[PDB]
Design a protein around this ligand. Sequence first.
Ligand SMILES: Nc1ncnc2c1ncn2[C@@H]1O[C@H](COP(=O)(O)OP(=O)(O)OP(=O)(O)O)[C@@H](O)[C@H]1O
Lengths: 304, 73, 31, 73, 375
Amino acid sequence: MADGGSERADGRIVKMEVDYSATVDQRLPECAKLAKEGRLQEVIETLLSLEKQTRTASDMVSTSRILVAVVKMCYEAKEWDLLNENIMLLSKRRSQLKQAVAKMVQQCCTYVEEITDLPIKLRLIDTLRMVTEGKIYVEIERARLTKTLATIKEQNGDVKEAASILQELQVETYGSMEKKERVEFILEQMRLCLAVKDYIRTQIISKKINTKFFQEENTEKLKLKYYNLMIQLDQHEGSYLSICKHYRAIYDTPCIQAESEKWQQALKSVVLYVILAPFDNEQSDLVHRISGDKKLEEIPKYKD
Amino acid sequence: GDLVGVNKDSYLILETLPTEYDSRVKAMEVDERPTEQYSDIGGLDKQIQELVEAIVLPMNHKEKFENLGIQPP
Amino acid sequence: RTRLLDSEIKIMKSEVLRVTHELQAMKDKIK
Amino acid sequence: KRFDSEKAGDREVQRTMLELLNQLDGFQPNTQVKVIAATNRVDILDPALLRSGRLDRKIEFPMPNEEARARIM
Amino acid sequence: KLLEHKEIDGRLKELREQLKELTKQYEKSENDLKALQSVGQIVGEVLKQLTEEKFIVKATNGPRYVVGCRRQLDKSKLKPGTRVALDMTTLTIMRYLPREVDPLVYNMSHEDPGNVSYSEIGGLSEQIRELREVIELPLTNPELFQRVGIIPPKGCLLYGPPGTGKTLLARAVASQLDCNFLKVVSSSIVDKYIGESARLIREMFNYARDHQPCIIFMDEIDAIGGRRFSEGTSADREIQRTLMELLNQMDGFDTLHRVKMIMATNRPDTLDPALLRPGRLDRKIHIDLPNEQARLDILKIHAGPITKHGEIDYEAIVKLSDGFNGADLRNVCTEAGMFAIRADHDFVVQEDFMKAVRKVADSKKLESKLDYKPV
Ligand SMILES: Nc1ncnc2c1ncn2[C@@H]1O[C@H](COP(=O)(O)OP(=O)(O)OP(=O)(O)O)[C@@H](O)[C@H]1O
């Protein structure tokens, strides 16, 4: 009840500054019984969000001192049992997990500078179940991008983390509408396929590239910088004729630049792939479509 | 689906007829409006009240409905 | 002091051209 | 009330009535109309004619008990 | 001494505005006076093409002719069954329009309104995503199917309790693709004739053969699908022949190209098992009663334009509810607001919502037979 969670939520904040987690063992059937009650709209969702919040104060006590992770797996053992008793059938009692687990990845944001890999990956093997099972979120999907990116940064990318992104590419493209950050995650597996050195897997994930259209409007210069990853798709391994739009996007990035060297290799890389591209109707006209620049005729190799 | 005046020779759409009167409907419109005050309705006065609250006030004041902001009946 | 003279000849040309706007209007409208 | 049977019944009428609902409501929904229907009985009517916005109210009229008989008489 | 410049300038601009307005309509009336020379062309149709310039056509109000085109009328595009406009006197072919339209199709195709997208619905993300896979993909990219090689599927059937928002989901699709929606109530087909129903079916399927990315939606199929029992009746044999117009003409000889068929019924039991084979309709997807974030999130879409306060206990409604569709939450919010009109609470109080729960959950007494599970 509201007063029944007001007396536990208001009456159990004092004991965290002094006591060991025995009042937390005097909260496991208290959060279990308050969740079995579970006021169906905004009451004990928010009261249990307060009680999981003071549980994260007990995480500042217990899971910030020794990092035992047995205290953690008991805490997500009662989160396991607390996700077990009530259905949550698109039922809306969920802020007990929202800012609780959002503060857990806030804690992991305070852990990656301090923690070793084993208890934080036990936290990750908890929250894989918690978020892929408990009503898939949006912002712990981007914290999923940084937590499986944290598993990448464990060994700085390999075939196993290439599998860890290949299992998480297109799962949450249709549940949560998104245009920016998972698009900044879809650029991440291409170096997880160049470290593998697999051009055809680079073209399978390039089939994953062109399922994300309307690249524009996302931020100011998101995609002008992303075009470096669009040109890394087939840069040195690319063909001679399938590279026209590929060796177009080399040039639109220093179009902002008033430089005369990297914008100059934008010119020379927008003109010397005609030497790549064989006899073409698209050759003999685009050599005069791109002709008209002021700095282009100022190369004797362009005269050549 | 309109009655129009068309030249016999040029076959040009000349004018629109003001004679689209629609048989039976325009005859279905009761133009006499016989009188019946509410003194004749004896026994259904609560139905007069819910009748007026349902029907008569949407004709007069939808601001009575949509300053509250839902719908009319 | 000659802009009023050129705009004035353009105003008599506006009366003649408006008479031909009522001749292009009215006189054609007759037929 | 519609049927699933053969050599009997009407599949027409309801075209006029779902065209009534069709032209009236939904297609440029404007609150410039009041639908007033007075059926003798209800049990013949379709359930798709009375739902929530077709006819919102179900106003029954009971028997004139004593004094509405003397009154209307 | 400069008032004469504006004194002739304003009169010159006034006579210029009246000159442009009067002489402009004089020029439009001159175009009408030239249009007095313009001739009403003849409505006809091509019976068949005989030679390169001999065209067997027929006057629409009578006799038959053989004439030719103007100079540049693209005679190859004249195919028998098209409509032409002819000269009046010389009677040779002047133009061709579309073909024909049969405007019973008009009053239900462009009748379709635009909607809010699938944010309006909730708790159907499996249906949104997988039904999105079976519908939206071969118009966005049918070549991933062709990278595989395999032909994309054709259509599906939604079921469950009636009024759970099958029509509402179809309107969400009507908001999503926004292109070519041909949505038929699919019981107004049998007027009193036999093949008139079929002829409307052929005309709709020919219009669907015309436009490439056509979308079909049908509802209440049981008045037009039916079941073939032993023939002893005399009015749903018409539904058997019309049903066979569906049996052929969902397949035909030519498959339909980008013509999706979205089917929704209330009882999918009494339909023909000949229809129930896949390929025609790929899958029967169940739509349930609304869950608690469907009642709630759909209720909060319905709680949008409401002059409420910090009072609204929604679980009084939802936990005092027991499964209520989007129009039933229109009933809850609407008639709760009607209790807000009661005693003229210009604001919105929560206690009227529980009153709406009393009235509607009270009014569930007249309704039974809650399910129809196909196949
Ligand atoms: N899954 C859903 N998501 C969002 N809104 C829904 C959903 N289901 C129903 N609704 C709401 O219900 C209302 C009616 O939906 P719809 O017209 O599809 O009913 P129906 O399923 O066609 O019912 P029936 O076929 O029995 O007439 C719509 O306004 C819609 O907003």
